[PDB]
Design an enzyme around this catalytic site. Structure first.
Site, short mmCIF file in Angstrom:
data_model
loop_
_atom_site.label_atom_id
_atom_site.label_comp_id
_atom_site.label_asym_id
_atom_site.label_seq_id
_atom_site.Cartn_x
_atom_site.Cartn_y
_atom_site.Cartn_z
N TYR A 156 25.64 31.27 47.47
CA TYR A 156 26.11 30.46 46.36
C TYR A 156 24.96 29.99 45.44
CZ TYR A 156 29.47 26.98 44.43
OH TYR A 156 30.27 26.20 43.63
N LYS A 163 26.33 22.45 41.40
CA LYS A 163 27.29 21.54 42.01
C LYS A 163 26.68 20.26 42.53
CE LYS A 163 30.85 24.00 41.30
NZ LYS A 163 31.90 23.62 40.31
N1 NAP Z 1 37.94 29.52 43.54
C1 NAP Z 1 37.17 28.87 44.42
O1 NAP Z 1 37.01 29.38 45.72
C2 NAP Z 1 36.47 27.57 44.12
C3 NAP Z 1 36.14 26.73 45.18
C4 NAP Z 1 35.54 25.51 44.91
C5 NAP Z 1 35.23 25.13 43.61
N2 NAP Z 1 35.56 25.95 42.57
C6 NAP Z 1 35.31 25.46 41.20
O2 NAP Z 1 36.53 25.36 40.48
C7 NAP Z 1 36.32 25.57 39.09
C8 NAP Z 1 37.18 26.71 38.53
O3 NAP Z 1 36.83 27.98 39.06
P1 NAP Z 1 38.01 28.97 39.49
O4 NAP Z 1 37.82 29.47 40.87
O5 NAP Z 1 39.26 28.34 39.00
O6 NAP Z 1 37.64 30.23 38.55
P2 NAP Z 1 38.08 30.64 37.05
O7 NAP Z 1 39.54 30.82 37.01
O8 NAP Z 1 37.25 31.79 36.69
O9 NAP Z 1 37.76 29.37 36.13
C9 NAP Z 1 36.47 29.19 35.60
C10 NAP Z 1 36.75 28.62 34.23
O10 NAP Z 1 35.59 28.09 33.64
C11 NAP Z 1 35.67 28.44 32.28
N3 NAP Z 1 34.35 28.45 31.64
C12 NAP Z 1 33.22 29.12 32.04
N4 NAP Z 1 32.28 28.90 31.10
C13 NAP Z 1 32.80 28.11 30.12
C14 NAP Z 1 32.27 27.57 28.94
N5 NAP Z 1 31.01 27.86 28.62
N6 NAP Z 1 33.07 26.80 28.11
C15 NAP Z 1 34.38 26.56 28.46
N7 NAP Z 1 34.90 27.07 29.64
C16 NAP Z 1 34.12 27.84 30.43
C17 NAP Z 1 36.22 29.85 32.27
O11 NAP Z 1 36.73 30.20 31.01
P3 NAP Z 1 36.59 31.68 30.37
O12 NAP Z 1 37.01 32.77 31.34
O13 NAP Z 1 37.44 31.59 29.12
O14 NAP Z 1 35.13 31.97 30.10
C18 NAP Z 1 37.30 29.71 33.31
O15 NAP Z 1 38.48 29.24 32.69
C19 NAP Z 1 34.83 25.85 38.92
O16 NAP Z 1 34.24 24.62 38.54
C20 NAP Z 1 34.38 26.29 40.31
O17 NAP Z 1 33.00 26.06 40.54
C21 NAP Z 1 36.19 27.15 42.81
C1 MJ5 Z 2 33.49 29.36 46.92
C2 MJ5 Z 2 33.52 29.36 45.39
C3 MJ5 Z 2 34.10 30.40 44.67
C4 MJ5 Z 2 34.14 30.36 43.28
C5 MJ5 Z 2 33.55 29.30 42.58
O1 MJ5 Z 2 33.49 29.23 41.21
C6 MJ5 Z 2 32.37 29.78 40.62
C7 MJ5 Z 2 31.50 30.61 41.33
C8 MJ5 Z 2 30.42 31.23 40.70
C9 MJ5 Z 2 30.18 30.99 39.34
C10 MJ5 Z 2 31.04 30.15 38.63
C11 MJ5 Z 2 32.14 29.57 39.26
C12 MJ5 Z 2 32.99 28.26 43.30
O2 MJ5 Z 2 32.47 27.24 42.60
C13 MJ5 Z 2 32.97 28.29 44.69
#
Ligand code: NAP
Ligand code: MJ5
Ligand code: NAP
Ligand code: NAP
Ligand code: NAP
Ligand code: MJ5
Ligand code: MJ5
Ligand code: MJ5
Ligand code: GLU
Ligand code: GLU
Ligand code: GLU
Ligand code: GLU
Ligand code: GLU
Lengths: 255, 255, 255, 255
Positions: A156, A163
């Site tokens: 990560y 984070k």
């Molecule tokens: N999925 C997981 O396992 C997981 C676990 C824990 C935490 N998270 C956290 O949850 C959040 C969402 O991630 P996700 O898994 O839902 O993935 P995701 O669907 O890819 O969402 C990431 C979002 O961030 C937006 N983004 C990136 N750069 C940006 C910018 N410069 N200005 C405005 N928006 C921007 C992207 O928009 P565009 O595509 O339009 O660029 C996308 O909508 C993140 O903060 C991530 O770190 C995810």
């Molecule tokens: C486990 C996990 C999976 C996806 C995630 O979202 C990301 C990961 C990499 C780059 C930008 C957003 C994340 O925060 C944590």
């Protein structure tokens, strides 16, 4: 949690798997009005199709790239004019170059490190400053984080340091904004199959570990993050700020 | 803890009050060879004067601004050729603009935020990567943090988010450089009257609160940070990595 | 770190594998006078044998079962009469039933839970209270804990809750004895093959998980804990109290 | 969060100021069936009088002194026959002798230490074991803790160590009961005037410090703890276990 006559701004829906879309579905079920923000058009044309599934009577969609002060400022300004005062913000935005999410943390470029910080951490500060203008009676801001902000997790890497920075951001904002009656909290989501999650090295190995080792012996989903977002965004959580709630099957509490 | 035939790079002495000069007196007292790096010609001048207090038979001094990849890269490479392989690095470097170290954190500028992250956190990553090249056999890297990285403390603002970042940086570096036998750790120093302290709002209030509330009821000084640095830099701490040791009279453990 | 003219009391050597014997070899190598306390007559016998490999001119050995106030009280009183004032105490004592250890935590018996608290935690408080009389000018007290006090670890069960209690006990003792200039700290040892490890279900698989995942990718040993004890018991750690130092190859810092 | 057709057991109302009576008011407002347990006659009498404020169509009252296994076993068994399967338990039970809530920790008696552990931490284990029998399907268990279990706080003393132990108990129960789809969590409440607070030395001083320093600059109340309890006892939090949620105006985030 009856949220009728509440208005929330939801940042970071890319597709049907985004964590923010689970948040959205849940608040939508509870009767909130939703405003959505997106980065590119590849999310607009698409957001618009996803909103058909919600009972949102109208599409409030705003392009905001949090790398631009002006887009965050003008964006939240437009939102206020179109929709009035809001009751809170769900921040679900993060980014790192793929090259920096695999192999050796020590080899991370300055440019890539500062980019992750800019988008994944600083963007909450500026969103909160501008959203406060629309929450004169108080409100609630929630950011998504991950356990890799608190421990070093294989792969990560730079996102883990972003984070960690976000989690502190949340506490310094909690302290700042508390006297204005604006609570700021984080949800630490367990691993979920998203678009951004294709970018993280060794993701499927993460999922399986959760299933084997976490107290609940299953993974979580978007809707479980949303249900906790609902508690945090509502009066149910009125005494709770600067908090990090792990919605991860208990994985955070074991070793 | 005898350190004869050990060599340490100390980064960040500006004057007699520097925390890094506390480290230097302790390491120098135990027989180590020291190399010093600095940013400002004022700091080189202070170093030349302070070296007359040490046992160091010759002055090894390198101008490294950690904002420049080139200056760090060429700085260590040069150090390697002047003294050969090293045993560790003591990193005592941080910076934020005064505007961002008082009043409201929600008003922090992007530029102010990234600047603190760049100097105060990322510098550790690039320094470790270049220092690894001079530690083929293993070694020890120590950075200096403050409690404000783990809790929202009044006025510390943009530097607290930078220290949270630094502490995660330490964990991720610990994990990545572990297999190379390089330990990475952090001393969390209590408040100490230094040049940089002069930019922290409320700083006298912080000192006084230590005296009144910390278990030992007294402030710490620079030599005490130095003595823990000796422990961390030496074989005494051989199974300790990714750790944050609070040298602060117990303050972290109370509320 | 030179310890001549210092006197330390070491509690909890049963045999050559004991963590406390690692502490003893380190402090002995450093010039300390050592006093030893034991429970079982077998441990006194192992001690008379293990003394032959130390530099100690005199065996100072005292039966102290920490379940009995009067033995702790009488034992420290007698130590003060025989060797005078002491500079600190190494506490390396814990106990739980197999029968509580080995099977669901929710099925732990009251008598087992309270026994584990009594020996493994409360004993620190009574020892500190009695040892303080032999430290009129200050001193240092170190206890041995395990990561399973901070996280729920498979099979560690009742002893996890006792180590959580023991680490709180350290902080509360730190705050209380701080003004008498007595420091109180904990060493979180990684897993080490000892007589007591045989009561932890799945010990072998815990050892192997360290080698594969801990930043240093190897297990620690008793001498490594002793080198950190030397630090904590000596003037090197003078500004450190209420602290918990992980001597576990960095395992505490990863998920 | 609609709680119709749920049944919850609430343990430790003594009067109208009890934290559990704020829990009761909330759960009752949301449509839950409630079963109440009490230790003193006086408490059953206050409960009889406080039930008139609630919408409970009947009084389900059970004397359970958690110092006795037989009472906890027979209590829950009776509850199972009178109301059938339940959906979770709110545990609001602690005790220590007055002399152990002020002055000097090091002087704590063994009897007082183990008495606090027995009632304030072990009780959760036995209650979880007995309540589990009435949750074939899954459920939720919540305990009440205080920040003094995570840091040393003046005067809280032996209760600080009992809460450190409670908080670990919550993580170990989560790990063990998780495969039965039973979640176990804690609420860390900020200071609230109750009967039990009268035993905490310096209590008014603690309350003033929250108003002065906590992010929200005001104290919490029993109903605010109860709204978070509603979130933890309900399916809103279906992905949250081994968690500690601080309902303390943000005070836990600041230093
Ligand atoms: N999925 C997981 O396992 C997981 C676990 C824990 C935490 N998270 C956290 O949850 C959040 C969402 O991630 P996700 O898994 O839902 O993935 P995701 O669907 O890819 O969402 C990431 C979002 O961030 C937006 N983004 C990136 N750069 C940006 C910018 N410069 N200005 C405005 N928006 C921007 C992207 O928009 P565009 O595509 O339009 O660029 C996308 O909508 C993140 O903060 C991530 O770190 C995810
Ligand atoms: C486990 C996990 C999976 C996806 C995630 O979202 C990301 C990961 C990499 C780059 C930008 C957003 C994340 O925060 C944590
Ligand atoms: N005093 C405290 O209470 C306290 C407490 C906890 C932690 N710390 C930490 O201790 C560390 C040392 O600070 P200090 O209190 O000892 O203050 P200091 O004497 O002012 O030292 C700060 C050092 O940082 C160096 N520095 C700043 N930017 C740099 C750059 N771009 N490139 C290279 N060097 C740079 C400065 O060098 P130049 O002057 O040459 O620019 C100076 O030597 C800092 O990380 C600080 O955060 C201090
Ligand atoms: N080994 C590990 O991997 C590990 C890891 C982390 C922490 N620890 C901690 O390290 C400490 C030392 O244990 P160890 O592994 O070294 O095992 P050990 O060699 O078996 O030592 C345990 C000691 O506890 C003593 N003891 C137990 N009950 C006592 C009582 N009522 N009164 C006085 N002494 C009593 C035993 O003395 P008698 O034999 O005379 O009964 C024995 O000397 C313990 O606190 C343990 O929890 C161990
Ligand atoms: N007030 C605060 O500032 C605060 C903050 C954080 C956490 N807490 C925690 O909140 C919980 C509730 O306390 P509170 O402040 O609401 O005070 P409270 O109204 O006095 O309630 C404490 C309850 O514990 C019960 N209890 C004590 N020993 C018992 C036993 N052996 N068997 C069964 N019940 C027993 C008492 O019942 P009887 O009267 O019948 O004996 C009483 O109902 C406690 O765990 C306390 O530690 C309080
Ligand atoms: C208590 C304290 C005092 C001085 C510090 O050093 C700084 C502070 C701000 C900017 C650069 C260095 C610090 O990190 C913490
Ligand atoms: C990994 C580990 C191994 C051994 C331990 O020591 C015990 C364990 C149970 C009862 C008495 C002493 C321990 O604390 C942790
Ligand atoms: C701040 C605070 C106030 C009251 C508390 O409740 C007690 C205290 C002592 C004994 C029993 C219950 C508490 O846990 C924390
Ligand atoms: N008293 C000044 C700064 C304190 C100092 O560092 O001397 C302020 O509060 O703005
Ligand atoms: N720094 C010493 C030992 C430190 C360590 O244990 O890595 C060396 O270069 O051997
Ligand atoms: N393998 C046995 C004993 C554990 C050990 O000490 O290796 C168990 O897990 O039941
Ligand atoms: N503050 C007084 C009164 C007790 C209380 O405030 O509860 C004391 O030292 O006990
Ligand atoms: N306690 C609720 C559901 C809690 C859970 O999600 O386990 C019923 O059963």
């Amino acid at each position: 949690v009856n949220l009728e006559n509440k208005t929330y701004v939801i940042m970071g829906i890319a597709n049907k798997r985004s964590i923010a879309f689970g948040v959205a579905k849940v608040l939508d079920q509870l009767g909130a009005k939703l405003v959505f923000t997106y980065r590119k058009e590849r999310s607009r044309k698409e957001l618009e199709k996803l909103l058909e599934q919600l009972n949102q009577p109208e599409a409030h969609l705003y392009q905001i790239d949090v790398q631009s002060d002006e887009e965050v400022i003008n964006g939240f300004e437009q939102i206020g004019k179109d929709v009035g005062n809001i009751d809170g913000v769900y921040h679900s935005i993060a980014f790192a170059n793929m090259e920096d999410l695999r192999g050796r943390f020590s080899e991370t470029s300055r440019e890539g490190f500062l980019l992750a910080q800019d988008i994944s951490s600083y963007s909450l500060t500026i969103v909160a400053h501008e959203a406060k203008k629309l929450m004169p009676e108080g409100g609630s801001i929630v950011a998504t984080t991950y356990l890799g902000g608190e421990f070093a997790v294989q792969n990560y890497n730079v996102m883990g340091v972003a984070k960690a920075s976000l989690e502190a951001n949340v506490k310094y904002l909690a302290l700042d904004l508390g006297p204005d009656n604006i609570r700021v909290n984080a949800i630490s989501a367990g691993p979920i199959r998203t678009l951004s999650a294709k970018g993280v090295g060794g993701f499927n190995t993460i999922l399986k570990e959760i299933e084997e080792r976490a107290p609940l012996k299953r993974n979580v989903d978007q809707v479980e993050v949303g249900k906790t977002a609902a508690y945090l965004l509502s009066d149910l959580s009125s005494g709770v700020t600067g908090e990090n709630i792990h919605v991860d099957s208990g994985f955070h509490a074991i070793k």
